[PDB]
Design a protein around this motif. Structure first.
Motif, PDB file in Angstrom:
ATOM      1  N   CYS A 143      27.867  12.424 -43.285  1.00 14.59           N
ATOM      2  CA  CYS A 143      26.493  13.342 -43.681  1.00 14.59           C
ATOM      3  C   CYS A 143      25.871  12.515 -44.643  1.00 14.59           C
ATOM      4  O   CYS A 143      26.635  11.834 -45.214  1.00 14.59           O
ATOM      5  N   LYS A 144      24.586  12.997 -44.854  1.00 18.86           N
ATOM      6  CA  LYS A 144      23.951  12.546 -45.979  1.00 18.86           C
ATOM      7  C   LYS A 144      24.354  13.084 -47.615  1.00 18.86           C
ATOM      8  O   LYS A 144      24.609  12.102 -48.630  1.00 18.86           O
ATOM      9  N   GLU A 145      24.692  14.396 -47.832  1.00 18.33           N
ATOM     10  CA  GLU A 145      24.941  14.887 -49.007  1.00 18.33           C
ATOM     11  C   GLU A 145      26.334  15.734 -48.861  1.00 18.33           C
ATOM     12  O   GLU A 145      26.264  16.562 -48.251  1.00 18.33           O
ATOM     13  N   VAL A 146      27.066  15.823 -49.970  1.00 17.62           N
ATOM     14  CA  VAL A 146      28.078  16.824 -50.051  1.00 17.62           C
ATOM     15  C   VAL A 146      27.985  17.348 -51.403  1.00 17.62           C
ATOM     16  O   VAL A 146      27.954  16.884 -52.529  1.00 17.62           O
ATOM     17  N   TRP A 147      27.509  18.854 -51.351  1.00 13.79           N
ATOM     18  CA  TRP A 147      27.497  19.594 -52.537  1.00 13.79           C
ATOM     19  C   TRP A 147      28.826  20.294 -52.658  1.00 13.79           C
ATOM     20  O   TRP A 147      29.263  20.837 -51.932  1.00 13.79           O
ATOM     21  N   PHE A 148      29.467  20.439 -53.921  1.00 14.89           N
ATOM     22  CA  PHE A 148      30.568  21.143 -54.133  1.00 14.89           C
ATOM     23  C   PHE A 148      30.581  21.968 -55.454  1.00 14.89           C
ATOM     24  O   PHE A 148      29.920  21.584 -56.543  1.00 14.89           O
ATOM     25  N   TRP A 149      30.817  23.231 -55.310  1.00 18.05           N
ATOM     26  CA  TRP A 149      31.271  24.063 -56.472  1.00 18.05           C
ATOM     27  C   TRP A 149      32.419  24.501 -56.696  1.00 18.05           C
ATOM     28  O   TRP A 149      33.269  25.150 -55.568  1.00 18.05           O
ATOM     29  N   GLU A 150      33.065  24.395 -57.895  1.00 18.02           N
ATOM     30  CA  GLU A 150      34.580  24.455 -58.136  1.00 18.02           C
ATOM     31  C   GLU A 150      34.881  25.982 -58.219  1.00 18.02           C
ATOM     32  O   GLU A 150      34.118  26.499 -59.019  1.00 18.02           O
ATOM     33  N   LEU A 151      35.858  26.364 -57.650  1.00 18.64           N
ATOM     34  CA  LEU A 151      36.279  27.679 -57.864  1.00 18.64           C
ATOM     35  C   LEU A 151      37.628  27.786 -58.450  1.00 18.64           C
ATOM     36  O   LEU A 151      38.661  26.886 -58.085  1.00 18.64           O
ATOM     37  N   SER A 152      37.999  28.623 -59.323  1.00 20.79           N
ATOM     38  CA  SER A 152      39.502  29.162 -59.791  1.00 20.79           C
ATOM     39  C   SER A 152      40.518  29.765 -58.795  1.00 20.79           C
ATOM     40  O   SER A 152      39.908  30.697 -58.005  1.00 20.79           O
TER      41      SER A 152
END
Length: 163
Positions: free
Chosen positions: A154-163
């Protein structure tokens, strides 16, 4: 609030048949009061169910956003679902619940940036796949696994960390 990974996962219907948390696309829509076939007829885009699955999981852990599909049945009747992956990702990106994503532009960066963390991943402009994919990601044996499926081509990987 910002949901806990474990609970978001528990509340998330996987589209992977072999997942303990699998739920068929038609049952997902039935739950919120729609017939899948009616929706596909109105907009074939509904065949991409990732954002609906993520929307519903977010709702069940208490994160509300604006969406464009009203739930018509069950406990969440009156709330809205965002069926577009990009549009859901944009919501999360500006939310105080999550904040800005980390955005990676190639697979080495994506993998190193995610590392051993777990959270919400959005695969944007996926090779040979329409509509993008938003999912839960975590480590499994020094590899990364998605609750439904990963799309690192893919062109972009967005990531939001969770606990």
């Amino acid at each position: 609030m910002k949901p806990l990974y474990r609970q978001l996962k528990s509340s998330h219907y996987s589209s992977d048949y072999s997942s303990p948390g699998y739920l068929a696309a038609e049952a997902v829509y039935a739950e919120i009061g729609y017939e899948l076939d009616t929706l596909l007829k109105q907009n074939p885009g509904y065949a991409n169910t990732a954002a609906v699955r993520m929307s519903l999981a977010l709702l069940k852990t208490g994160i509300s956003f604006k969406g464009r599909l009203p739930i018509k049945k069950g406990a969440y009747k009156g709330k809205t679902i965002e069926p577009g992956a990009k549009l859901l990702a944009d919501q999360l990106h500006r939310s105080s619940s999550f904040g800005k994503a980390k955005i990676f532009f190639n697979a080495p960066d994506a993998e190193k940036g995610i590392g051993n963390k777990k959270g919400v991943v959005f695969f944007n402009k996926i090779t040979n796949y329409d509509g993008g994919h938003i999912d839960l990601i975590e480590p499994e044996n020094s590899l990364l696994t998605c609750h439904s499926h990963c799309y690192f081509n893919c062109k972009e990987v967005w990531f939001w960390e969770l606990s």
